């Protein structure tokens, strides 16, 4: 399947303004860029893109109600200022399995002051020594890293 067909199927013959959760699993994107999503989406609250073949999140619209964004099992790498400004209200984020070099590229996520949980897994950044504490220092607003807090306690919903 392709992006646009998947989005249309998820919409369920409804306007793109009454969706509170969008599931785009095992989809595909051309040129590794986001397609289909537009400004009309303004009620989305729980997004999910897995194995979508996106090179970078460079065409994400302004989902001001986007709170639980997930970009997992993908190869997203590059600047994250687009996520910082387009969706400044992110609360839960997931980048597990992504391609990220070091903290110099994850710094822009500090702009979002509502990020209560940031998840990283099987990445290059996690290889660095004292990765957990260094990220916590870089993101004080964060409270649960990799589903664990600063004192290694599981994070109940």
């Amino acid at each position: 399947m392709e992006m646009g067909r998947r989005i249309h199927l998820e919409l369920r013959n409804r306007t793109p303004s009454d969706v509170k959760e969008l599931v785009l699993d095992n989809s595909r994107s051309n040129e590794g860029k986001l397609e289909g999503l537009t400004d009309e989406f303004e009620e989305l609250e729980f997004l999910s893109t897995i194995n979508v073949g996106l090179t970078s999140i460079a065409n994400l619209p302004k989902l001001n109600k986007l709170k639980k964004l997930e970009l997992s099992d993908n190869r997203v790498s590059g600047g994250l200022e687009v996520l910082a400004e387009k969706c400044p209200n992110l609360t839960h984020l997931n980048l597990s399995g992504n391609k990220i070099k070091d903290l110099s590229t994850i710094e822009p996520l500090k702009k979002l002051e509502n990020l209560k949980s940031l998840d990283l897994f099987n990445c290059e950044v996690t290889n660095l020594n004292d990765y957990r504490e260094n990220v916590f220092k870089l993101l004080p607003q964060l409270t649960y890293l990799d589903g664990y807090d600063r004192d290694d306690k599981e994070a109940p919903d």
Partner: protein, 147 residues
């Protein structure tokens, strides 16, 4: 048989009659709740809290039916067997319904997957306590099985 297999048997029985169960829930929830086959499940649930679980799931189903467009089969399948006891009123918002399993309190998370109830959406397959349980009859996100 034991509780471990009793849970799987109950879920299998529920999913075999999914059409009839769904019709009854949409039209006659009460008689569905008083079904005899649910007797052993409530035996595992502690006798000091079954009423609270039943009331919570019943009010959740009331809210579910009141709203439209948010249908979720997995939640209904997961929480149906808990609605088969005298539903004493309560206000605390439960998040983990205890399930006794051979002297071992096993909880069920209402939202998301749990060890006692694991449903994989990618493969659309349901298993309980690791043991195989079955699968759902669907493919598109509109309520059809013709594909």
């Amino acid at each position: 048989n034991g509780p471990e297999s009793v849970l799987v048997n109950t879920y299998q029985w529920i999913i075999r009659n999914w059409e009839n169960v769904k019709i009854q829930w949409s039209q006659d929830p009460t008689m569905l709740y008083n079904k005899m086959e649910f007797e052993p499940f409530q035996s595992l649930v502690p006798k000091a809290a079954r009423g609270q679980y039943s009331g919570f799931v019943r009010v959740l189903f009331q809210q579910m039916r009141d709203v439209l467009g948010t249908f979720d089969t997995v939640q209904i399948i997961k929480l149906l067997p808990f609605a088969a006891a005298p539903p004493e009123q309560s206000r605390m918002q439960f998040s983990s319904l205890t399930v006794n399993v051979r002297g071992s309190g096993m909880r069920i998370v209402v939202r998301g997957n749990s060890p006692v109830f694991n449903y994989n959406k990618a493969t659309k397959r349901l298993t309980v306590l690791g043991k195989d349980a079955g699968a759902l009859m669907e493919d598109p996100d509109e309520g059809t099985a013709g594909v």
